[PDB]
Nucleic acid binder design. Structure first.
Ligand SMILES: Cc1cn([C@H]2C=C[C@@H](COP(=O)(O)OP(=O)(O)OP(=O)(O)O)O2)c(=O)[nH]c1=O
Ligand SMILES: [Mg+2]
Ligand SMILES: [Mg+2]
Lengths: 412, 555
DNA sequence: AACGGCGCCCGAACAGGGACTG
DNA sequence: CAGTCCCTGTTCGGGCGCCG
């Protein structure tokens, strides 16, 4: 009884044609059980090879959850419908969400399964379930309703979501509610007891209309930043000063007031690296002035909503991971550091996966965008393992880099 | 008025703005003429082919080739122009079934659908785009032109449509027989069950009659009831499997196309024969671009080919997959960037073997390549068994721990244990984390002229040691590596080295043990001989310490 | 002389960053 | 500041194996 909102691709772009990648046994058995129930409910329908489109599919388990969750990699389809969920029916981003003391994330993507999908657009949501040892050919489906993980789903459902959240927002004018992909970000300054009570009231408000029982909690008021800091030693060697001048010279690309004149004068000659060099009066002055500039904020650094976010991550060792978010080089909007995450001291890929999820979550809360990641890892290493550790219902864009640490800039 | 088959049709369109095929026939031999007129007549009576007239302004040439191990001929339609104008299909064939992924079944039957493509109907509105003429005489009778009501052999949409149509017909039977495994690859059907031999034939006949309801025939000439079964090019025995006998050519003179077929068979043989190498054979397939050019076999390529033939002498076999037992994968280093592995569940009962010999990167080490081999085995194991095997690797836990904790890139190996079988993989040198007290400090630098390709490389040290070496036909990057090589040559067992070259430092910090560059291989040899090496980097052209001094010498 | 599938080893074309020269 | 170079990386299409 609902008219299908017409959906069109961006002009001059065809649908996605991405090959399905191999899935483990437990993931194939999970998707077969899930898709059988979705077909019986009419959410998806089987298709044939005359549909040349395809999008990868796999399954995940959220944190502290033993239930399998179907996850479609609509990253290609999403950027082929960008003029829809950003120009036509965009979702405004509240600047106060990052200021709330607590923010709960609610998986509301199940609600999208009640709105029909435009018939002329269903062919683009095609996916293929693989089989172990290629016992059977791929089992292809397409979506009949708004699919989870597609950016067009929250945009079309937004009019329905507004009406559902209308009584709750009136009841609580202080609560900030933001919607991104399949998730609902609910932030309040209420105490932990009061917050979770208000979250449960929102859950019951949605029930009177399979992962609604979960609530991942955030605290953006506690989110820290990792500035560039200079070492403080009692004695300085030639090697210490060479590293310091190297760090300051690179930091000058960000802070143009940094000077290295007096510090470089300490190395006049051809000295042994372990020779102790006493800091002169001017050297102490220049180093003290540089420590103050690194505390001052960078000039002309602000968020441009028209530009993409970019995230770089550095493996610092011993479970330490630093990251920077920016839109223009050396104009970082945020710098941080993670330590002692899951997989620390045993699994780089799990740690890097966790870091990508944390950074993306922070970017959704602060700006409402996900960044494109520059991952310090080989493509084959990441693509072999990352789905084993993914616990989010969205997927960011990423590319692969290899930058040897010539100077430890973000972590001494 | 042709009957409609029970198989649901597949709606096939064309790319917009384009029409059907209009290609003239190809003059063929009279032997092919007397082998196609009988086909178009039999398919006309059976309804598989209808005759058209002048209202079909299309044409497409066809040819015929003998079937493999059969008196019957095979007809193929050259739809290369139709495929360029036909819509794209998504292939539902995602891979190739492997016998090592099969589980033990008490009873096994291998079927083969007769006239596969000729039993699935074509789209109604698409049959008009398949026009072709058949001259009864090579230059006398104009020949009546026919069309296709089924899937033609040669059309790019025929495989995908048949594989999807076959699945829809088997789905009700598989739902009625859950405990029966049916491996479905193209028209061949592998059917296995733990039922008794008598009860197994009962369900087989039920399946043969189920397919018959949709017009799919399973003749007796390609019905296999007795092991060994010929399936996907393998010999399936009740408790083991092996590849069909592989014959390597033995020509007195070897060209280029002969080696391409030789390395191919060896790649196919490496899935069950342990220890196959194709490094030196494929090394001959470089530079020369003439498939009909004779290439002499090198002494290394001859010894490699000899050791592969002796491996193929003794008969080998794989076993089947038992899900109640764990998956084990063990790797050995074959030398020269070559790795071989075995996947098994019980000791000395290999499910399959394989090799990894890809050389990626100009500079690398054994640990990187072992990590790549693990990733290849992992992905291969998820395709075949849907799970990652436990690894047995010839690398110490301490060696691996030192590498991955200190490497700047994320790297990881799944659950694994150390197996002490030389040659063990190790790191051949370790760069110091701090400058060395008492070791001479070398400030190195190199510069080259872009035009004349002339350059200098040298160093200055804290003790007054100094060298400048003029170089010809070089680059800035080469002179920076040469400067480090000079400092390693002229220093004691412990040395500190300060360079401004991000290029050189990036190579050496990754601890390579092999390189396509002779200069880097010489630098590695020096690094192995040292007891302590500390590399430090400073920005160039900043008046920093001895770097400012050696910069003057070389520029 | 046809189509589709997967695997390997090869080279040409292309991309991207330090670094030098106008 | 651009436009090159040197060098190293990925992508892709074809060679071969093999299946149908
Ligand atoms: C071997 C082969 C096969 N095919 C297509 C056609 C039918 C299926 C199976 O071929 P087949 O089993 O050998 O012959 P088929 O048509 O089934 O007839 P039968 O010999 O089984 O009776 O794949 C093809 O297009 N080109 C080929 O070279
Ligand atoms: Mg057949
Ligand atoms: Mg230099």
């Amino acid at each position: 009884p609902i008219e299908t909102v017409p959906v069109k691709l961006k002009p001059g772009m065809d649908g996605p044609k991405v090959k399905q990648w191999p899935l483990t046994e437990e993931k194939i058995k999970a998707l077969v059980e899930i898709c059988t129930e979705m077909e019986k409910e009419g959410k998806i329908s089987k298709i044939g090879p005359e549909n040349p489109y395809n999008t990868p599919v796999f399954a995940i388990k959220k944190k502290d959850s033993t239930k399998w969750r179907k996850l479609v990699d609509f990253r290609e389809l999403n950027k082929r419908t960008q003029d829809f969920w950003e120009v036509q029916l965009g979702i405004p981003h509240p600047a106060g969400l990052k200021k709330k003391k607590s923010v709960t994330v609610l998986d509301v993507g199940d609600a999208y399964f009640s709105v029909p999908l435009d018939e002329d657009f269903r062919k683009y949501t095609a996916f293929t379930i693989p089989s172990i040892n290629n016992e059977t050919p791929g089992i292809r489906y397409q979506y009949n309703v708004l699919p989870q993980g597609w950016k067009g789903s929250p945009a079309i459902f937004q009019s329905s979501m507004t009406k559902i959240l209308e009584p709750f927002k009136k009841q609580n004018p202080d609560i900030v509610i933001y919607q991104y992909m399949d998730d609902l970000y609910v932030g309040s300054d209420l105490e932990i007891g009061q917050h979770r009570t208000k979250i449960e009231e929102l859950r019951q408000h949605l029930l009177r209309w399979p992962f609604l029982w979960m609530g991942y909690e955030l605290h953006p008021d506690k989110w820290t930043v990792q500035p560039i800091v200079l070492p403080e030693k009692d004695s300085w060697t030639v090697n210490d000063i060479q590293k310091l001048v190297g760090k300051l010279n690179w930091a000058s690309q960000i802070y143009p007031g940094i000077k290295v004149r007096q510090l470089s004068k300490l190395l006049r000659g051809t000295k042994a690296l372990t020779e102790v060099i006493p800091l002169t009066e001017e050297a102490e002055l220049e180093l003290a002035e540089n420590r103050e500039i690194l505390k001052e904020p960078v000039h002309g650094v602000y968020y441009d909503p028209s530009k993409d976010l970019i995230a770089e991550i550095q493996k610092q060792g011993q479970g330490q991971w630093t990251y920077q978010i920016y839109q223009e080089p050396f104009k970082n909007l945020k710098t941080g550091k993670y330590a002692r995450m899951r997989g620390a001291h045993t699994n780089d890929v799990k740690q890097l996966t966790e870091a990508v999820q944390k950074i993306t979550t922070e970017s959704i809360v602060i700006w409402g965008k996900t960044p494109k990641f520059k991952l310090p890892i080989q493509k084959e290493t990441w693509e072999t393992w990352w789905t084993e550790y993914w616990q989010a219902t969205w997927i960011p864009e990423w590319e692969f880099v290899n930058t040897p640490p010539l100077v430890k800039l973000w972590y001494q | 008025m042709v009957p409609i088959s029970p198989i649901e049709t597949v709606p096939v369109k064309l790319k917009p703005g384009m029409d059907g095929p209009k290609v003239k026939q190809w003059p063929l031999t009279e032997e092919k003429i007397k082998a196609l007129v009988e086909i178009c007549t039999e398919m006309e009576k059976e309804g598989k082919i209808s005759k058209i007239g002048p209202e079909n302004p299309y044409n497409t040439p066809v040819f015929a080739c003998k079937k493999k191990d059969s008196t019957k001929w095979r007809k193929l339609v050259d739809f290369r122009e139709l495929n360029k104008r036909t819509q794209d299909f998504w292939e539902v064939q995602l891979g190739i079934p492997h016998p090592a992924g099969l589980k033990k079944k008490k009873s096994v039957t291998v079927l083969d659908v007769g006239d596969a493509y000729f039993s699935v109907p074509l789209d109604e509105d698409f049959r008009k785009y398949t026009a072709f003429t058949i001259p009864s005489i090579n230059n006398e009778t104009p020949g009546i032109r026919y069309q296709y009501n089924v899937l033609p052999q040669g059309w790019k949409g025929s495989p995908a449509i048949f594989q999807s149509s076959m699945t829809k017909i088997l789905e009700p039977f598989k739902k009625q027989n859950p405990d029966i495994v049916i491996y479905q690859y193209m028209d061949d059907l592998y059917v296995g069950s733990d039922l008794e031999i008598g009860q197994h034939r009962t369900k087989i006949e039920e399946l043969r009659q189920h397919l018959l309801r949709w017009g799919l025939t399973t003749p007796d000439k390609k019905h296999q009831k007795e092991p060994p079964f010929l399936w996907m090019g393998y010999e399936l025995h009740p408790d083991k499997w092996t590849v069909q006998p592989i014959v390597l050519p033995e020509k007195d003179s070897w060209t280029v196309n002969d080696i391409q077929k030789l390395v191919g068979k060896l790649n196919w043989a490496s899935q069950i024969y342990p220890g196959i190498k194709v490094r030196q054979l494929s090394k001959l397939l470089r530079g020369t671009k003439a498939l009909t050019e004779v290439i002499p076999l090198t002494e290394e390529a001859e010894l490699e080919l000899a050791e592969n033939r002796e491996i193929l002498k003794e008969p080998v076999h794989g076993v089947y997959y038992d899900p109640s037992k764990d998956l084990i994968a063990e790797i050995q280093k074959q030398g020269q960037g070559q790795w071989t592995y075995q996947i098994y569940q019980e000791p000395f009962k290999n499910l399959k073997t394989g090799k990894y010999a890809r050389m990626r990167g100009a500079h690398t080490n054994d640990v990187k390549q072992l990590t790549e081999a693990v990733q290849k085995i992992t992905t291969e194991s998820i395709v075949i068994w849907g799970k990652t095997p436990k690894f047995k690797l010839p690398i110490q836990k301490e060696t691996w721990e030192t590498w991955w904790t200190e490497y700047w890139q994320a790297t990881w190996i799944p659950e694994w244990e150390f197996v002490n079988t030389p040659p063990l993989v190790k790191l051949w040198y370790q760069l110091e984390k701090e400058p060395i007290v008492g070791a001479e400090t070398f400030y190195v630098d190199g510069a080259a002229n872009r035009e004349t390709k002339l350059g200098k490389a040298g160093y200055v040290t804290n003790k007054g040691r100094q060298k400048v070496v003029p170089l010809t036909n070089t680059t800035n990057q080469k002179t920076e590596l040469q400067a480090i090589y000079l400092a390693l040559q002229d220093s004691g067992l412990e040395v500190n080295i300060v360079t401004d070259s991000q290029y050189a430092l990036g190579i050496i910090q990754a601890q390579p043990d092999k390189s396509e560059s002779e200069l880097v291989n010489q630098i590695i040899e020096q690094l192995i001989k040292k007891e302590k090496v500390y590399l430090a980097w400073v920005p160039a052209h900043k008046g920093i310490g001895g770097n400012e001094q050696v910069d003057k010498l070389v520029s």
